[PDB]
Amino acid sequence: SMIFKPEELRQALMPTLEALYRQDPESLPFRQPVDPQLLGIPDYFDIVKSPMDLSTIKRKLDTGQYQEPWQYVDDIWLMFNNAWLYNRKTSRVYKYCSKLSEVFEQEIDPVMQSLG
Ligand SMILES: CCc1c(C(=O)NCc2c(O)ccc3cccc(O)c23)[nH]c(C)c1C(C)=O
């Protein structure tokens, strides 16, 4: 497979993460890991087996933990899928998740094309 350097991936992908951080208030529940004790949802880790959030993804981009860009896409999707799984379909966080996913779908496609 074709190699991707960490600096190359950060430069290309960080603007798509920025697009999510720019969604205010919609990104706010996603900017830090879910804390089930604080949020009063003790069953969270029983339902969501692989937690993910924007701060974790940003750290991985910053430190160079992605070898290829689809690994980043996978983490973004994991974050969305967790929220759609756990939260009720009429809930604020479910709706915020849907908004972030719409933004991501629009931003990510030209970026992935350029990476090749
Ligand atoms: C519903 C708890 C939850 C949060 C969260 O952090 N809620 C608290 C929150 C904020 O941390 C910041 C702004 C909020 C603005 C509105 C409603 C909220 O609740 C907000 N984030 C995720 C991914 C979940 C679940 C379970 O999937």
Short mmCIF file of N, CA and C and ligand atoms in Angstrom, two decimals, residues 25 27-35 38-39 41 44 48 52-53 79 82-84 86-87 91-94 96, ligand 1:
data_model
loop_
_atom_site.label_atom_id
_atom_site.label_comp_id
_atom_site.label_asym_id
_atom_site.label_seq_id
_atom_site.Cartn_x
_atom_site.Cartn_y
_atom_site.Cartn_z
N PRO A 25 -23.84 24.83 18.65
CA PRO A 25 -23.54 23.91 19.76
C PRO A 25 -23.40 22.41 19.46
N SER A 27 -21.34 20.23 18.19
CA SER A 27 -20.15 19.46 18.57
C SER A 27 -19.91 19.40 20.07
N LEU A 28 -20.58 20.23 20.87
CA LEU A 28 -20.23 20.34 22.28
C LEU A 28 -20.30 19.02 23.05
N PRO A 29 -21.36 18.20 22.83
CA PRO A 29 -21.38 16.92 23.54
C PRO A 29 -20.33 15.91 23.07
N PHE A 30 -19.59 16.23 22.00
CA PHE A 30 -18.61 15.32 21.38
C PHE A 30 -17.16 15.75 21.57
N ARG A 31 -16.94 16.85 22.29
CA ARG A 31 -15.59 17.41 22.44
C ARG A 31 -14.73 16.75 23.51
N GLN A 32 -15.34 15.86 24.30
CA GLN A 32 -14.66 15.14 25.36
C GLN A 32 -15.29 13.77 25.50
N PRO A 33 -14.56 12.80 26.07
CA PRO A 33 -15.16 11.50 26.27
C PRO A 33 -16.42 11.56 27.14
N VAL A 34 -17.40 10.73 26.81
CA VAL A 34 -18.57 10.58 27.65
C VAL A 34 -18.13 10.12 29.05
N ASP A 35 -18.56 10.85 30.08
CA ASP A 35 -18.35 10.47 31.49
C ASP A 35 -19.70 10.00 32.05
N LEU A 38 -20.78 11.46 35.69
CA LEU A 38 -21.22 12.85 35.58
C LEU A 38 -22.58 12.99 34.90
N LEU A 39 -22.79 12.24 33.82
CA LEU A 39 -24.00 12.36 33.02
C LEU A 39 -25.16 11.48 33.50
N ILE A 41 -25.67 8.16 33.53
CA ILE A 41 -26.05 7.12 32.59
C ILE A 41 -25.19 5.88 32.83
N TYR A 44 -24.01 3.24 30.12
CA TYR A 44 -23.36 3.67 28.89
C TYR A 44 -22.35 2.65 28.37
N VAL A 48 -22.16 0.94 24.79
CA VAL A 48 -21.09 1.43 23.92
C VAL A 48 -19.77 0.80 24.35
N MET A 52 -15.62 6.79 21.65
CA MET A 52 -14.81 7.65 20.80
C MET A 52 -15.35 9.07 20.87
N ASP A 53 -14.46 10.04 20.78
CA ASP A 53 -14.87 11.45 20.76
C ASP A 53 -13.87 12.28 19.99
N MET A 79 -17.62 7.28 16.46
CA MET A 79 -18.20 8.31 17.33
C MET A 79 -19.68 8.56 17.01
N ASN A 82 -21.89 5.36 17.83
CA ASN A 82 -22.11 5.23 19.28
C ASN A 82 -23.26 6.10 19.75
N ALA A 83 -23.28 7.35 19.30
CA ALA A 83 -24.32 8.29 19.72
C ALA A 83 -25.69 7.90 19.18
N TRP A 84 -25.74 7.43 17.94
CA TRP A 84 -27.01 6.98 17.38
C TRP A 84 -27.51 5.71 18.05
N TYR A 86 -26.86 4.80 21.33
CA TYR A 86 -27.20 4.98 22.74
C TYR A 86 -28.41 5.89 22.95
N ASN A 87 -28.42 7.02 22.26
CA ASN A 87 -29.41 8.06 22.51
C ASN A 87 -30.71 7.79 21.78
N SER A 91 -33.81 12.59 20.68
CA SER A 91 -33.02 13.33 21.66
C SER A 91 -32.11 14.36 21.01
N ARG A 92 -31.74 15.35 21.80
CA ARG A 92 -30.86 16.41 21.34
C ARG A 92 -29.53 15.87 20.86
N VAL A 93 -28.91 14.98 21.63
CA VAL A 93 -27.59 14.49 21.22
C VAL A 93 -27.66 13.65 19.94
N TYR A 94 -28.73 12.86 19.77
CA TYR A 94 -28.94 12.12 18.53
C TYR A 94 -29.06 13.10 17.35
N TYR A 96 -27.98 16.28 17.22
CA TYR A 96 -26.65 16.89 17.04
C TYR A 96 -25.70 15.98 16.27
C1 LIG B 1 -26.36 12.65 26.61
C2 LIG B 1 -24.98 12.44 27.20
C3 LIG B 1 -23.94 12.53 26.09
C4 LIG B 1 -23.00 13.62 25.78
C5 LIG B 1 -22.87 14.88 26.54
O1 LIG B 1 -21.74 15.31 26.73
N1 LIG B 1 -23.93 15.52 26.98
C6 LIG B 1 -23.72 16.70 27.74
C7 LIG B 1 -23.59 18.00 26.96
C8 LIG B 1 -22.32 18.57 26.88
O2 LIG B 1 -21.23 17.94 27.42
C9 LIG B 1 -22.12 19.79 26.24
C10 LIG B 1 -23.19 20.46 25.67
C11 LIG B 1 -24.46 19.90 25.74
C12 LIG B 1 -25.50 20.62 25.14
C13 LIG B 1 -26.80 20.12 25.18
C14 LIG B 1 -27.05 18.91 25.81
C15 LIG B 1 -26.02 18.18 26.41
O3 LIG B 1 -26.37 16.99 26.98
C16 LIG B 1 -24.70 18.67 26.39
N2 LIG B 1 -22.23 13.34 24.73
C17 LIG B 1 -22.52 12.15 24.20
C18 LIG B 1 -21.80 11.60 23.00
C19 LIG B 1 -23.60 11.56 25.02
C20 LIG B 1 -24.15 10.21 24.74
C21 LIG B 1 -24.74 9.42 25.86
O4 LIG B 1 -24.07 9.74 23.62
#
